[PDB]
Amino acid sequence: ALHWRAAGAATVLLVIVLLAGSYLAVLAERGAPGAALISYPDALWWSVETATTVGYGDLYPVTLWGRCVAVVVMVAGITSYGLVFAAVATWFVGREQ
Amino acid sequence: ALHWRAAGAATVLLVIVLLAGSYLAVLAERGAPGAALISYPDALWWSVETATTVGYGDLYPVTLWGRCVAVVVMVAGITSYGLVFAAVATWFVGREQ
Amino acid sequence: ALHWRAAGAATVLLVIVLLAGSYLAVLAERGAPGAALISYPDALWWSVETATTVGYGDLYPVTLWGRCVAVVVMVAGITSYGLVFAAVATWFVGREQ
Amino acid sequence: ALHWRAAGAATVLLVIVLLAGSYLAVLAERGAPGAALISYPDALWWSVETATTVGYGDLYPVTLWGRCVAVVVMVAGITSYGLVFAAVATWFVGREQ
Amino acid sequence: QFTNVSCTTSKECWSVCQRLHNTSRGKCMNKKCRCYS
Numbered sequence: 001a002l003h004w005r006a007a008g009a010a011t012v013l014l015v016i017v018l019l020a021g022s023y024l025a026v027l028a029e030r031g032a033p034g035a036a037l038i039s040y041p042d043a044l045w046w047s048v049e050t051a052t053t054v055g056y057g058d059l060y061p062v063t064l065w066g067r068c069v070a071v072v073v074m075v076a077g078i079t080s081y082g083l084v085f086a087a088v089a090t091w092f093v094g095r096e097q
Numbered sequence: 098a099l100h101w102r103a104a105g106a107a108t109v110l111l112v113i114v115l116l117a118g119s120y121l122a123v124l125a126e127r128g129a130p131g132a133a134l135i136s137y138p139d140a141l142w143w144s145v146e147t148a149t150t151v152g153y154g155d156l157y158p159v160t161l162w163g164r165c166v167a168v169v170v171m172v173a174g175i176t177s178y179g180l181v182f183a184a185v186a187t188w189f190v191g192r193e194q
Numbered sequence: 195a196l197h198w199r200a201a202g203a204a205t206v207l208l209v210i211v212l213l214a215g216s217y218l219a220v221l222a223e224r225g226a227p228g229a230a231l232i233s234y235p236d237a238l239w240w241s242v243e244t245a246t247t248v249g250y251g252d253l254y255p256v257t258l259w260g261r262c263v264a265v266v267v268m269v270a271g272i273t274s275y276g277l278v279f280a281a282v283a284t285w286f287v288g289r290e291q
Numbered sequence: 292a293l294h295w296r297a298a299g300a301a302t303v304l305l306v307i308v309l310l311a312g313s314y315l316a317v318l319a320e321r322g323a324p325g326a327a328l329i330s331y332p333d334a335l336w337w338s339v340e341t342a343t344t345v346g347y348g349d350l351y352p353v354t355l356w357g358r359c360v361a362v363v364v365m366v367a368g369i370t371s372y373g374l375v376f377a378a379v380a381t382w383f384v385g386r387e388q
Numbered sequence: 389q390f391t392n393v394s395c396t397t398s399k400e401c402w403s404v405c406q407r408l409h410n411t412s413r414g415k416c417m418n419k420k421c422r423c424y425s
Binding site for chain 3: 377
């Protein structure tokens with residue numbers, strides 16, 4: 001019992017880092033040459049994509065802070081998603097019949 | 098037996114959520130300040146990329162609905178793709194000889 | 195053995211589909227005012243990114259053919275990459291000590 | 292023990308290839324009709340995203356060298372990330388309680 | 389900045405930005421090329 005919980009909990013991390021980063025970068029990018037967000041309603045959306053290795057492009061980070069969030073959210077989003085990919089593998093093995 | 102079917106079926110999910118989301122967002126983005134998600138012929142293409150963690154950038158969501166679809170299609174696309182990544186792992190273990 | 199060869203060979207697929215798709219779309223996009231995929235030297239680069247779930251944005255296939263290649267190259271790139279992700283998992287298990 | 296170390300070390304690779312590639316492409320892209328990226332403070336950021344299959348779009352290297360780095364950093368970033376995805380799978384199996 | 393700029397290539401998208409106001413480097417959107425800093 002771990003592949004399940006570990007995966008289920010992983011989702012929480014990505015969720016947290018998502019909001020945090022968004023607001024973290026916003027406060028910065030807000031006052032500096034950055035993407036077209038200058039707010040959470042827009043930034044939050046950027047974090048979500050960045051977390052899912054998406055990164056549309058319509059709004060990308062530039063400033064140190066803004067960029068720092070992208071990397072922070074990326075590792076968090078991937079980590080949470082990874083546990084899920086491996087979680088299924090563990091359970092997939094426990095089903096010979 | 099599961100890693101095979103589970104993976105094969107997973108592809109179906111991504112396929113469904115793809116079309117659905119596209120049309121779901123279109124109806125919305127159609128009458129809102131968005132990139133170019135007004136028609137299905139174009140939106141559908143956007144969903145496909147978003148599902149494969151691609152997101153070129155040309156066609157990106159902006160409105161709540163339009164954006165909501167991106168996230169919905171993202172989770173679906175990744176989930177279907179994930180099962181495949183893990184599916185091979187399970188079978189990969191059963192081939193010592 | 196299989197996780198090794200399967201992964202090593204997978205790389206070949208992505209390589210093939212890459213060139214093919216590029217040239218396949220080029221011939222099409224070439225005569226379709228909308229995307230910057232008229233020359234191989236440029237298209238080939240687009241296929242590579244699309245195969246690695248990258249999709250910078252500079253080249254966003256629009257025409258049916260051009261777009262068709264993106265999806266074809268995407269599945270190929272991911273498939274080849276997937277086998278590698280799972281390949282390591284199989285071998286990772288055979289090293290408890 | 293391998294799934295752990297292998298994964299922990301993998302992160303190092305992506306880190307190295309990241310900086311290297313960035314500087315490698317910069318020296319090139321810096322002087323050539325490729326993209327805008329003509330420095331490390333900016334290039335480095337591009338490599339990070341490219342390594343995480345992100346590729347926002349703000350930076351689209353066209354030149355041979357500049358483009359070569361993208362592919363080099365992509366394989367490195369994915370390889371390091373892959374080991375992590377599989378690493379968790381191996382450990383995930385060693386937990387029935 | 390985001391104005392009504394044609395969308396065909398990236399190499400040209402820059403020349404337009406510099407000409408319009410005084411910027412460069414900008415992705416291309418299905419609608420219109422967007423200018424960035």
